[PDB]
Amino acid sequence: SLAPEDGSHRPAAEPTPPGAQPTAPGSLKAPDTRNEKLNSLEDVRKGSENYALTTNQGVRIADDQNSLRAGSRGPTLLEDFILREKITHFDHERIPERIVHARGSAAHGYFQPYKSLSDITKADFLSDPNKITPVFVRFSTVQGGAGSADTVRDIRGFATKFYTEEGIFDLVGNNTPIFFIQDAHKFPDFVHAVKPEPHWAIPQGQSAHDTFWDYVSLQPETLHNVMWAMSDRGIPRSYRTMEGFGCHTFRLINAEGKATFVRFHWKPLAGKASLVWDEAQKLTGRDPDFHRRELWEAIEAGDFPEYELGFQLIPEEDEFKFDFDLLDPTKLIPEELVPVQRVGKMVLNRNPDNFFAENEQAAFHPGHIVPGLDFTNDPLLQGRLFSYTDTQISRLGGPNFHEIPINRPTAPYHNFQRDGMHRMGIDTNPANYEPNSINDNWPRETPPGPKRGGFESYQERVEGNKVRERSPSFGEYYSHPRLFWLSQTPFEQRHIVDGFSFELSKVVRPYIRERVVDQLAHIDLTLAQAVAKNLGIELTDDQLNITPPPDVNGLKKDPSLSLYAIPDGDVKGRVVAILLNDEVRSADLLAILKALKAKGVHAKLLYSRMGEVTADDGTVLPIAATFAGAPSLTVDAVIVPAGNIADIADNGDANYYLMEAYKHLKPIALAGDARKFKATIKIADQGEEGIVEADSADGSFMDELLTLMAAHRVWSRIPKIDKIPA
Amino acid sequence: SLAPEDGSHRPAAEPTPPGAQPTAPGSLKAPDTRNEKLNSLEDVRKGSENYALTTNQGVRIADDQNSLRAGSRGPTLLEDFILREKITHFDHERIPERIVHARGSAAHGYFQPYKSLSDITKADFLSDPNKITPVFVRFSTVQGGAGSADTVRDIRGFATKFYTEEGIFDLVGNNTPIFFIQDAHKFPDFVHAVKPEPHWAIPQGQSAHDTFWDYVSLQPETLHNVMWAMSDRGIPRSYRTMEGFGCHTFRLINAEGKATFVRFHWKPLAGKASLVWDEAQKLTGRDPDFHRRELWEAIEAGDFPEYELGFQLIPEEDEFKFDFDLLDPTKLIPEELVPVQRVGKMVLNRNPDNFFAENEQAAFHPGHIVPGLDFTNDPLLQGRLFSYTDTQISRLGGPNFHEIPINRPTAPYHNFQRDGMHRMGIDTNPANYEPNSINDNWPRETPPGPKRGGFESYQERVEGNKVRERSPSFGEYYSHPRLFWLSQTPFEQRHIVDGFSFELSKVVRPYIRERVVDQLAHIDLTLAQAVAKNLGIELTDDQLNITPPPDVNGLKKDPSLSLYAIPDGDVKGRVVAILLNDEVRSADLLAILKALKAKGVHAKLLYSRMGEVTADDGTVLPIAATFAGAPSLTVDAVIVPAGNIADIADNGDANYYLMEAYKHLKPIALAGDARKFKATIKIADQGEEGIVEADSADGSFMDELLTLMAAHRVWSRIPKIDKIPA
Numbered sequence A, B: 001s002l003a004p005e006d007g008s009h010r011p012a013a014e015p016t017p018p019g020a021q022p023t024a025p026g027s028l029k030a031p032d033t034r035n036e037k038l039n040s041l042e043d044v045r046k047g048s049e050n051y052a053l054t055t056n057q058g059v060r061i062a063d064d065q066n067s068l069r070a071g072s073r074g075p076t077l078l079e080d081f082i083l084r085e086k087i088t089h090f091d092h093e094r095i096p097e098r099i100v101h102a103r104g105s106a107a108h109g110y111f112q113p114y115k116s117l118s119d120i121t122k123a124d125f126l127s128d129p130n131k132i133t134p135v136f137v138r139f140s141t142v143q144g145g146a147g148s149a150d151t152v153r154d155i156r157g158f159a160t161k162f163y164t165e166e167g168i169f170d171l172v173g174n175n176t177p178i179f180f181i182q183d184a185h186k187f188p189d190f191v192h193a194v195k196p197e198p199h200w201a202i203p204q205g206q207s208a209h210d211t212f213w214d215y216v217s218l219q220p221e222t223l224h225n226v227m228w229a230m231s232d233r234g235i236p237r238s239y240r241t242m243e244g245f246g247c248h249t250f251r252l253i254n255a256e257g258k259a260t261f262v263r264f265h266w267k268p269l270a271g272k273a274s275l276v277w278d279e280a281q282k283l284t285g286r287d288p289d290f291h292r293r294e295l296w297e298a299i300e301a302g303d304f305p306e307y308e309l310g311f312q313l314i315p316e317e318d319e320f321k322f323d324f325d326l327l328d329p330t331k332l333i334p335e336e337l338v339p340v341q342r343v344g345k346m347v348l349n350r351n352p353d354n355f356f357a358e359n360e361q362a363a364f365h366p367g368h369i370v371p372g373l374d375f376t377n378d379p380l381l382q383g384r385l386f387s388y389t390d391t392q393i394s395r396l397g398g399p400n401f402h403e404i405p406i407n408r409p410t411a412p413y414h415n416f417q418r419d420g421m422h423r424m425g426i427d428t429n430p431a432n433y434e435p436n437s438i439n440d441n442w443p444r445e446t447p448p449g450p451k452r453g454g455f456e457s458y459q460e461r462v463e464g465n466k467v468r469e470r471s472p473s474f475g476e477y478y479s480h481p482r483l484f485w486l487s488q489t490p491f492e493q494r495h496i497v498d499g500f501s502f503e504l505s506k507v508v509r510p511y512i513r514e515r516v517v518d519q520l521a522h523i524d525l526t527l528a529q530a531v532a533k534n535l536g537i538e539l540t541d542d543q544l545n546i547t548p549p550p551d552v553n554g555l556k557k558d559p560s561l562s563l564y565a566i567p568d569g570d571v572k573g574r575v576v577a578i579l580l581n582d583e584v585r586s587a588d589l590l591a592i593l594k595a596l597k598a599k600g601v602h603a604k605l606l607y608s609r610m611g612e613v614t615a616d617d618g619t620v621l622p623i624a625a626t627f628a629g630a631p632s633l634t635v636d637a638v639i640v641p642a643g644n645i646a647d648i649a650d651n652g653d654a655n656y657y658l659m660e661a662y663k664h665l666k667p668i669a670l671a672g673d674a675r676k677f678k679a680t681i682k683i684a685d686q687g688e689e690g691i692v693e694a695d696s697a698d699g700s701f702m703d704e705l706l707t708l709m710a711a712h713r714v715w716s717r718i719p720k721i722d723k724i725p726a
């Protein structure tokens, strides 16, 4: 008996805020959260308490602390099969990581539609508002390895596995509505350019290097998704506060056989929010697991990530009615032209039990569609359909990867396929071929129909020669970048400019920087001049005269392209650092903590050491972390309560905490004598927007703080930080 | 889409300082650097210039931009074999990463002994001071994935493959002279405890989490290597500035059959140097590839990493003469008791061509020994011999891993083994078995003997019963941690206290922190109290009365265990940041660069934008990076020349650059009006040891700065940094 007698080793099986309890496997943390897929995994879940330690063959082990040897100081004997089985399993624990999106965090939850969509699709999962579909969702970065950092600048993956009654549907999307390239044949060129360079394998988790910007400079089709990566879109606050997109035009097919073109959307119900670059980069160092941790702890807290599925729908007759090709995955469809229609809601409400078993081994692939959905000729989508099945044969060891428990359909599956490595299913069918008479031809084909029918492809007309040729309709590269640029706020534009400037400064060959700047001059002159200035590059007279590209179907902006132009803040699940002193004014802290609790905002009590401090009234305040141990990078706002300020007024870490949070545009609130920290951040006596201050934390102090938190960051402070030494 | 006409895409094939040229594959950067192993790889090196792009089957490709489709907007066709080969290769690029030491950086070089060691070993590679042995060396962390960060707190690996005339010898060592555990059987328990926890796969690259500290608190045998990990040894400045150790007692066997116990050492000729924690942690975010990059750039610069191989030799009859067991790998042999005898020098002088092929696929294993060497019954070593062959079967795809080019011996190999996946060698031998008459028994066994003989194991006497039992002589855990503690300088002690304090503050379960502090009370009360104070823990009366463990064979300390107590600094290969202004005083820059060049110290010229600035005399100065883009973390010292100081005096990044360098104990030099920055770091008029200052940069100024750099950091400044908000 090694556990503490007080039972404090074991986290309460009830929702608890971040940091309050150690984290745990989902079935231990939240045993009564269930769905059909979670229940179906019960046949393979393995417990431990009260069981004997054994070999994999079931033999109980007496001494798991020693190898068998000839004498207690002698040589280890080959007949020690317990040692060998244990070390063999260890020596083969690793499997190949994903070629891209190797870094990813996942959770279980469920989806339900708001209403039946039978008029536009026969997909069973969308047929009835009372039909609940379990999901498993993995969010990811793109470039870095499975052991790379979360808050890099990169695109994010958002993959959802829907366990429907008519088969697995995988919606394998990203957090921007387009991709860098037009044709899948170039995917290894593009990925090789952005991945670590081949001689030395540097840099990890970063497009800020020569080969990426060389490819970009030579392939102007990439510029649209580059604009997105260079914006604050490339550095999300949380996987809960990013948008999701299905990337391509697909089809919905209804019972009557009508095809409708569709693009998939996920809207984050917690709003859109991103970090700023200095903060994101420093956070990869202070907590490279910040997004993985945040997702897990939001779920443990009951701040379940929620997303609304939406569809942009385009009738078949309108295929050619846009300035851009609907099949070109480097073009978005502006919501001003084609609104997103709300479809249903997804809630992620339980973490995995074992990350390897459920997250690392999960296989998602956009060819896993169901009757009521179909593909289009998008030439990127078309090659994806090859890759996602092929890649599993090495990654997951063979063609039986659908029998790995997380991957299994909850729908029935039966067919004549046999054997392969790791075969689990034991087929009793006398027949392994069809047509057969020996089993009366079962299992049998099923005609398509309105429900529960076999899959049949939409009978799209194909006409043309066998050609390796890009459609001329795809040959336009600058208007969508420009539409994105013009849709961003002035602070968002600034962060785009700074993204390009920072990245191109890491490009060692200066001609590549020049070449990129020339491409920027084809998008927007102000953008190009500002990046040029930061690189000490002067635009030529020709570059200054490049006529900008056309508006997109008469649009000069679309505010849905901005993270921030239309406010959508939600404070629930956000977190505030509270900087303690050794004699806190307890009435300030009561007011602060209850106001935060009322809005579902968490807190972390910080000090210069661990343990406890005592408030003016004798309340014992438990310390969550030190100032250095839990830097302002990890919180959304900082509050300093009144009290013995002299305790921390000269603490370099305390001061720096505020300078850091100040630089990164976070709200800061200062009560009572905590106002002496005004001098540290240079705040005028009469105060400034984004700094909450009063004699005490009562009255409107917490409402004003919460109002600032609802708007995410204090963009007005940007000219002020430019000269802060932090 | 081509190269610039000025040829600036291509790095000069000459040694060049870091940042002067883009880095390149070793055979192109240094084509005249050769050794027997590098040459033998010529059969598989593949160029590219002037060659046609092809499939893997040698078919020239006309259009590498497009998939084959039916019309230019049509579906992709299954007959596109060029697309499918290219995507299939890409889909299967990844192989499983190493179970441990997955993160590593490697180079080629050579070794030679100083004198023949034939009196103690018949190993051919130690037999003649003029026989050169090619090596390939991989340096690594331990816990994190292949895409984790370099400057984490962790043990480092130091593995050397010697391609000898009598076979491959791999010396597979670490940067500390012991390991955490005693018996190989516990290796998966320990590794699982330090690795990301299994529910959520957090944290990456860090022992700062509950499971690791839980295991340590329950297994006091770990405390010795924990002491080393918590010290600054856990955060080396560079792989060139750490020691290497072979971890176990091995044996040398001479021609007369005499056995001598030996422990292996590598002494860095660039001296011993480590980061400080805050710097190390921030650098994992600002450059997670810092040690990989620094190693590669040192070799491109000609600052070849050099190490001296050294042996601790113990005669056989002295096996039991110490107060610890020689076979216990948690115990070190103090150099005060047994001196390291210098044996030879290893120089790393070329980088690989392709990191995957040469680095990722290299397989090192300590059972790969050669005649003249042998094992002992160390129970950690004993089990390692099982693991390093077994693990390659999955990692490298089968039993022909020695045919992967980097792993091939340069010595002949012939045997009767056949087949296995991706078998390269085509055996012509009529016989695949022995004894045979049909090939007159070739290849044949060879008797053991003085040189070129068959391997025979030293005939060690074994006497004991078949037992799973730890030797009673291994059951002492506190004396070596105490010896280590007492041998550290006071600032090294403080950093150890700080590492335990910082780590234990991230352990969520408070009873684990308490149990570790109790263990510390068994080693040293001063250490234990200092950690307790930071965790808000109070030692009990009993804990206060724990009798300190005994001295190690009479030793109160051994200064060879400290990084810094005996000066051994070498500035060649270090780097200085030079903060420019838009009118640099060229006379200062002239004298700065002249002095730096004379000691082989590199410079990086920094500014607030990229491009060029012009000095007072018209000299045009290209800018390597911005203040933000190459932070003071990445350099050893900072110099600010005179000139138009107003240009940068109110720049927040330039001021912070000095604040961060100051906090991290780095030398700073300020010439002319740059002395105005003394105000940002609160240096008094009189000046301060560690801040060099004068009217101009001259002989005296540079000598002073270079003296400071030879001492690595300004430890006397430590009292002054608590207050700086940085």
Ligand code: HDE
Residues within 6 Å of the ligand: A098, A099, A100, A101, A104, A138, A139, A140, A156, A157, A158, A159, A172, A173, A174, A179, A183, A184, A185, A187, A245, A246, A247, A248, A329, A362, A363, A364, A380, A381, A383, A384, A387, A388, A389, A391, A392, B091
């Ligand atoms: C639309 C969102 C999107 C796009 C446009 C692409 N990826 Fe993805 N990808 C694989 C291949 C692949 C191809 C061939 C193309 C364009 C031709 C794309 N990608 C672009 C893959 C190598 O087969 C992949 C790696 C492992 C795997 O199972 O499939 C893969 C991963 C991936 C993920 C991660 C899903 C997960 O396992 O968490 C996501 C979200 C995308 N891709 C999105 C995506």
Ligand code: HDD
Residues within 6 Å of the ligand: A087, A091, B098, B099, B100, B101, B104, B138, B139, B140, B156, B157, B158, B159, B172, B173, B174, B178, B179, B183, B184, B187, B246, B247, B248, B329, B362, B363, B364, B380, B381, B383, B384, B387, B388, B389, B391, B392
């Ligand atoms: C019984 C298991 C076992 C134990 C007890 C040890 N090792 Fe080990 N080591 C392995 C089992 C292993 C391994 C699992 O087999 C690895 C990873 C995969 C590989 O090829 O070997 C490995 C890799 C590995 C590497 C990386 C070589 C490379 O760059 O590829 C180094 C430097 C060490 N080990 C060093 C050590 C040291 C100094 C030890 C303490 C004396 C030690 N190992 C004990």
Ligand SMILES: [S]
Residues within 6 Å of the ligand: A177, A178, A179, A246, A247, A248, A329
């Ligand atoms: S996409």
Ligand SMILES: [S]
Residues within 6 Å of the ligand: B177, B178, B179, B246, B247, B248, B329
């Ligand atoms: S070791």
